[PDB]
Write a protein that binds this DNA or RNA. Structure first.
Ligand SMILES: [Mg+2]
Ligand SMILES: [Zn+2]
Ligand SMILES: [Zn+2]
Ligand SMILES: [Zn+2]
Lengths: 94, 147, 117, 46, 49, 240, 95, 98, 259, 67, 156
RNA sequence: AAUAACCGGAGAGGGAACCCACU
């Protein structure tokens, strides 16, 4: 809610977070919520010297995820949705 | 081009070709006419009321008042209107010199000009043009539909 | 529904080039220059300049159709004089006139703005 | 899933689900309009 | 009860009687509409003498 | 009843057998244009791209026909239907597999007409036989038929919202015979009173009179401009 | 994520110039590969590699054997019987 | 402007114009029709003279700059309708995305 | 055989307009100088309107139309900007455009006049001419409804649309006394003395000139407020020079291809 | 429906003149004099502000059925 | 999944041969008619093009050594008719290879991000391999343009 | 120790009368 309000106000939002762990849950939530307010215009920048490597490593590890995601793998598709985000170009990692 | 504009006297017509302002001619000042109705319409239609309206409109616009045009007045006519034109400085009979916008040379013959009133009619072109290429067919007989 | 897009009056697309030239067979030493997407902005002043030089026998310009933005200039110049070089000389003279007129207006405008007192 | 409609006389926002009476929740008016879209729109000034 | 009979707008029994411009604009009807036509099945019909 | 179904204008005899609907026939309002010759008529891009003309695939033009076919529908110069020799009818409006786009001699191509094509062009009431003329099509941007002014005398049209029907002959032999008979300049004189009918429109009539006044004088630049447009011109200025 | 390997197209079978194409199945019994094999059988310039054992008594064995007439159509291009099996060698089992 | 409350009134085939203007020259009787309050058509400086030969018979040559600045730009309306119908269980018409 | 030496001079200048005279020049070049003012004098005007929510009684497309025609101060930043269709970037970039915002929510009983002063701009160099006199009206608003839109303005010129045309009115003429006799008066008494005439009261008709050509052309250019008239004229001449240079380059390449 | 922000023929900005013009007319001036004071010299610009009809007040008179 | 060819009609049922050569009896309403591709093609393992109503010999399978006219074609099967075969009206089914002759973008808002129409926002109606029709949001017109110039702004 | 299953597999459904309006 706060992120949406700030972006609507037109400011800029900064978010500190390790490039792993809670970031992925946060990204799923944001992926589901962005379309709620239709903020497709505002892009997400993920800046870190290990951003790309962390994303790819999260993608490959399927056997360790939850059952839902392991099934999402058995149905050929990358388990996390930030891959779909990157393919859609809303989120850019640098 | 293809619309239907109708004056207040039955001088119907369709917008032949649309020119840009630079190509459109002008009088000495920056005024450039908006519509060029053909000269040859008047001599057979005998709608001189159109000319009188155009003249009176120029007079009224210069004067700053809405000139009246009651049918049976008999108190106002061409001579009074021409006198008012003499007062306001334009030509007696409403003609003015115009300039070609392509070459720039002055138009050899002075021209009639002035304001008037137009109404674009409901017969837009987009509502009439259509074409068929082996579409549907009626049920009773194997022929093209209608409308 | 069919109105041509507005910019079609000045933009040139691929497959066509601004200028084309063709030789005339009716009379010797005559050439036709076709200019695409151009209107009486230049089609007049080119003739007005070229008629100045006496080396040219005929110079003309015509638009095949106003809705089709295109102009053709046919010129027949005196023998030993090439239409190409005559045309280029006329245009460069016109450019010089235009630029020097610009400068004269520049100096006049400073004169006026600072005052004619 | 449910859509956002406008009463008219109340000017009040209300929700309605399919196959339901078309009445404002407090005045029960019968005329019901539909709200603008959320999809973008952009006109060239021409 | 016998039945229903149409009434033209701006009649002496119509709802649009005695209400000035303010009232009619409140009711979102043009105050300038001359009235004198029957509304039927939604469409707006007129009698030709 | 059957008798009512036959007797009236809508009966099978008159309004359905002698006069029956037909395709390949556009309709719209006309608009004057002097620039183009008497034999030409302008048409809009929409009609020219929605109207169809058949073509037999031949090696002389097979390259161009294939270069046109792969363009597909929705592109003005293009074809929308391809019909095989055996009678198989394959449409291109649904973008089929590219394999069928191969062409060979003998096939039928349903391609849009471009300039040069002949078309018949009438205005009901078609009282005298000269309201049914042919013309060569030309493409112009805005949406209305464009025809030369001198043609409006035989049609009795005046452009004030008068519309005019346009049929496109489909077969090639019919195209040729229409070309050789109904094309306008072959009907300047009329059988009813052995006179010319194309005449001269009111405006050019007054203009030519005022121009050919006995004392008209004209300047060098103006003459050099006027002579440009004479199509049949030799190319030599006359002596003043 | 392969930079230079792209999905095959049937219509490319006729395309000129040297080419490299993988194909299925390794047994050739049905042979979408066999389609291109029949297409190019006449040419002696092309190679084909069979990196595994073929089923005896099938088109696999007919091609395995060198006779031209393999079904009656004659094979002319050159075959190389390679062995890229991923199984255990005697030393592997012993180790 | 065919009637004041055109926005709310949902007719069929309703044309309305951007810029109505009371005519410059008129009768005295016009204002008793309220025609001054709901005028239809725009004044237009006209010039009666064959200019280019593109306006021979009942034709007119229009300045395009005026059209682009608001000369007679009109808007056009159209209203549809639909009666979803419930029947004796042989047919039941309902509003739903197919 | 060479282009004569053009000679000019201004009569007087003012913010509203500029009046001047051209001497020793041809009719065709004078006419082209006029036409360039009307057509080829690029300026900045709003050209891309995106409406978040519109609720007034003017339908949206009307609002886009009206916002199209507002004038903007483009004294010099027009040269810096580079055409949108020509600028290679993502959609609009600060180089090839300018950004405007307009949000109004009439909450008071009285009607509010949404006017050009409410258009918040991004670059101070460009603003509605009224800002830097009454305001230009956009749309009136009743209590309750709102108007919220974002606009992008770019650099165009006369041909594309008449919203880019800054020359309110150009008066061009010459031979105020028909000396050249291009025009003919059947009753020269009736016609009014041109303000630039030098004839006497009785004559009111200059003598026929057996030998002469149009000269001493008179120009009166009235700015619409987008650009100062002197800047308008200078930009016109510079753009015409650019066009001529383009023609020369292309035709030189064509000649080289020919030979 | 509103004042046209520009002269159809010239281009002179006319939209901003309207409220000032109504003020002048309420100030008991003859429309011609008040117009000239507002500075409209050509009759191709005078016409709009002289014979323009303002309906937007009529349209505003109603309630917003959309809110 | 499995189509059949009627070999006999009955008072209330139909005797139909299935794809595997088994004759079954089904109700009149049990089966449904299917569109027939009269211009389909097949291959019988010897690469010579074959079509319906073409004479072919069955040289392998249970019906090896026979001949008949191709009645129906499938992806991998064919219903062949032989007059001499009295059974099942002479129809049978065998695989073709044992015979010898005798888009994403549709419905998605997009943006013309480069070209003469830079900045416009339209909707895509027709998507080809290279070009695409866009219905603009301003003009009463629709345009053609290459996919390279698009950028699926907004969208779902 | 298993192999390209049409891979934009698209025809359309009243009508009949009346009145209005354009030529
Ligand atoms: Mg007529
Ligand atoms: Zn309510
Ligand atoms: Zn940019
Ligand atoms: Zn004006």
């Amino acid at each position: 809610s706060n992120l949406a309000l700030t972006v609507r106000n037109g400011g800029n939002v900064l978010v500190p977070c390790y490039p792993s762990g809670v970031i992925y849950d946060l990204l799923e939530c944001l992926y589901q919520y962005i379309d709620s307010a239709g903020l497709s215009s505002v892009p997400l920048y993920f800046i870190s010297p290990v951003a790309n490597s962390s994303l790819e490593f999260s993608q490959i590890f399927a056997e360790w995820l939850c059952h839902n995601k392991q099934s999402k793998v058995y149905l050929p598709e990358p388990p996390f949705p930030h891959a779909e985000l990157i393919q859609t170009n809303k989120l850019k990692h640098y | 081009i293809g619309d239907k504009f109708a004056s207040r006297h039955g001088q119907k017509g369709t917008c032949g070709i649309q020119y840009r302002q630079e190509d459109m001619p002008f009088t000495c000042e920056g005024i450039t006419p908006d519509i060029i109705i053909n000269p040859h319409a008047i001599p057979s239609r005998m709608t001189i009321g159109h000319l009188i309206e155009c003249l009176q409109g120029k007079v009224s616009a210069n004067k700053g008042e809405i000139g009246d045009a009651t049918p049976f007045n008999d108190a106002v006519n061409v001579q009074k209107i021409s006198n008012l034109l003499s007062d306001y400085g334009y030509h007696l009979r409403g003609n003015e010199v115009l300039y070609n916008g392509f070459t720039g040379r002055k138009i050899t013959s002075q021209i009639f000009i002035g304001p008037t009133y137009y109404q674009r009619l409901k017969h837009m072109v987009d509502d009439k043009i259509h074409s068929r290429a082996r579409g549907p067919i009626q049920i009773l007989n194997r022929q093209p539909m209608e409308g | 529904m069919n109105a041509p897009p507005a910019f079609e009056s000045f933009l040139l697309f691929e497959g066509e080039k601004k200028i084309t030239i063709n030789k005339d067979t009716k009379v010797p030493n005559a050439c036709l220059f076709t200019i695409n997407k151009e209107d009486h902005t230049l089609g007049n002043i080119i003739k007005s300049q070229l008629l100045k030089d006496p080396q040219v026998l005929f110079a003309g310009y015509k638009v095949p159709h106003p809705l089709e933005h295109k102009i053709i200039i046919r010129v027949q110049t005196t023998p030993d004089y090439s239409p190409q070089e005559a045309f280029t000389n006329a245009i460069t003279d016109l450019i010089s006139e235009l630029s020097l007129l610009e400068e004269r207006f520049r100096v006049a405008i400073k004169d006026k703005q600072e005052g004619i007192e | 899933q449910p859509m956002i409609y406008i009463c008219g006389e109340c000017h009040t926002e209300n929700e309605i689900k399919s196959r339901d009476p078309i009445r404002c929740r407090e005045c029960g008016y019968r005329i019901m309009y539909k709200k603008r879209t959320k999809r973008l729109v952009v006109f060239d000034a021409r | 009860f016998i039945g229903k009979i149409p009434i033209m707008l701006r009649s002496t029994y119509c709802l649009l009687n005695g209400l000035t411009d303010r009232d009619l604009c409140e009711l979102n009807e043009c105050p300038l509409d001359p009235g004198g036509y029957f509304i039927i099945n939604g469409s707006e019909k007129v009698l030709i003498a | 009843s059957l008798k009512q179904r036959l007797k009236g204008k809508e009966g099978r005899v008159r309004g359905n057998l002698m006069g029956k609907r037909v395709d390949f026939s556009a309709r719209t309002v006309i608009t004057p244009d002097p620039n183009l010759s008497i034999d030409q008529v302008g048409v809009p891009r929409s009609i020219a791209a929605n109207m169809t003309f058949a073509e037999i695939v031949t090696p002389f033009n097979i390259d161009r026909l294939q270069e046109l076919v792969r363009r597909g529908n929705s592109q003005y110069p293009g074809a929308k239907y391809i019909i095989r020799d055996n009678g198989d009818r394959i449409d291109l409006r649904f973008h089929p597999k590219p394999s069928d786009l191969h062409l060979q001699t003998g096939y039928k191509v349903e391609r849009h007409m471009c300039d040069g094509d002949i078309v018949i062009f009438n205005r009901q009431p078609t009282l005298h036989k000269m309201s049914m003329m042919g013309h060569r099509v030309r493409i112009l941007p805005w949406s209305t038929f464009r025809l030369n002014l001198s043609v409006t005398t035989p049609y009795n049209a005046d452009f004030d919202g008068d519309e005019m029907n346009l049929h496109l002959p489909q077969s090639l032999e019919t195209r040729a015979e229409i070309q050789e008979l109904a094309m306008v300049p072959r009907m300047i004189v009329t059988p009813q009173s052995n006179r010319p009918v194309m005449g001269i429109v009111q405006d050019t009539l007054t203009a030519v009179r005022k121009f050919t006044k006995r004392d008209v004088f004209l300047e060098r630049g103006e003459v050099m401009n006027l002579l440009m447009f004479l199509s049949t011109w030799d190319g030599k200025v006359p002596q003043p | 994520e392969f930079k230079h390997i792209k999905a095959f197209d049937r219509a490319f079978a006729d395309n000129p110039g040297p080419m490299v194409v993988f194909a299925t199945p390794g047994m050739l019994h049905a042979g979408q590969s066999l389609q291109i094999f029949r297409k190019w059988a006449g040419n002696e310039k092309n190679m084909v590699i069979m990196p595994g054992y073929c089923v005896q008594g099938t088109v696999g064995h007919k091609i395995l054997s060198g006779q031209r007439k393999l079904e009656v159509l004659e094979v002319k291009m050159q075959v190389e019987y390679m062995s890229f099996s991923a199984h255990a060698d005697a030393k592997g089992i012993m180790q | 402007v065919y009637i004041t409350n055109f926005h709310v009134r949902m007719d069929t085939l309703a044309h309305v114009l951007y810029y109505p203007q009371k005519p410059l020259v008129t009768t005295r009787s016009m204002e008793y029709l309220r025609f001054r309050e709901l005028p239809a058509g725009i004044n237009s400086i006209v010039a009666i003279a064959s200019y280019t030969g593109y306006n021979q018979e009942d034709s007119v040559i229009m300045n395009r700059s005026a059209v682009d600045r608001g000369f007679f730009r009109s808007v056009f309306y159209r209203s549809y309708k639909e009666q979803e119908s419930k029947k004796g269980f042989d047919q039941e018409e309902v509003f739903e995305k197919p | 055989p060479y282009a004569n030496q053009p000679t000019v001079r201004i009569t007087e200048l003012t913010d509203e307009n500029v009046k001047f005279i051209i001497e020793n020049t041809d009719l065709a070049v004078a006419n082209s100088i006029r036409r360039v003012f009307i057509a080829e004098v690029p300026i900045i005007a709003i050209d891309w309107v995106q409406i978040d929510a519109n609720s007034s009684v003017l339908h949206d497309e009307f609002i886009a139309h009206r916002l199209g025609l507002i004038p903007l101060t483009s004294d010099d930043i027009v040269d810096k900007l580079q055409y949108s269709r020509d600028c290679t970037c993502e959609e609009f970039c600060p180089e090839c455009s300018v950004e405007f915002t307009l949000d109004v929510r009439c909450n008071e009983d009285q009607t509010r006049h949404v006017t050009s002063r409410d258009l918040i701009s991004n670059s101070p160099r460009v603003i509605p001419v009224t800002s830097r006199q009454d305001d230009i009206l956009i749309v009136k608003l009743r209590k309750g409804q709102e108007l919220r839109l974002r606009a992008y303005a770019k650099k165009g010129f006369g041909k594309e649309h008449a919203k880019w045309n800054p020359t309110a009115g150009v008066a061009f003429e010459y031979d105020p006394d028909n000396a050249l006799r291009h025009t003919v008066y059947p009753k020269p008494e009736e016609w009014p003395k041109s303000e630039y005439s030098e004839l006497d009261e009785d004559e009111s008709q200059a003598p026929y000139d057996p030998n002469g050509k149009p000269e001493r052309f008179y120009y009166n250019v009235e700015s619409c407020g987008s650009l100062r008239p002197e800047t308008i004229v200078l930009s016109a001449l510079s753009g015409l020079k650019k066009k001529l240079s383009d023609l020369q380059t292309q035709l030189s390449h064509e000649i080289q291809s020919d030979v | 429906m509103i004042i046209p922000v520009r002269c159809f023929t010239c281009g002179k900005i006319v939209g901003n003149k309207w409220e000032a013009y109504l003020g002048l007319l309420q100030a008991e001036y003859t429309e011609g004099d008040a117009l000239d004071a507002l500075g409209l010299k050509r009759y191709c610009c005078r016409r709009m502000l002289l014979a323009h009809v303002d309906l937007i007040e009529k349209l505003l008179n109603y309630a917003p059925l959309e809110k | 999944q499995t189509v059949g060819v009627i070999v006999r009609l009955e008072r209330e049922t139909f005797q139909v041969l299935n794809m595997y050569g088994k004759v079954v009896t089904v109700r009149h309403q049990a089966v449904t008619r299917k569109k027939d591709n009269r211009f389909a093609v097949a291959l019988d393992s010897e690469q010579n093009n074959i079509h319906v109503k073409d004479i072919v010999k069955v040289i392998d399978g249970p019906h090896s050594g026979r001949e008949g006219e191709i009645r129906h074609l499938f992806r991998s099967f064919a219903f062949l008719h032989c007059k001499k075969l009295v059974e099942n009206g002479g129809m049978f089914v065998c695989k073709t290879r044992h015979l010898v002759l005798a888009n994403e973008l549709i419905g998605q808002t997009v943006r013309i991000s480069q070209g003469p129409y830079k900045g416009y926002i339209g909707v895509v109606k027709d998507a080809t391999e290279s070009t695409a029709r866009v219905e603009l949001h301003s003009t009463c017109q629709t345009i053609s343009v290459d996919r390279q110039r698009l950028t699926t702004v907004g969208s779902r």
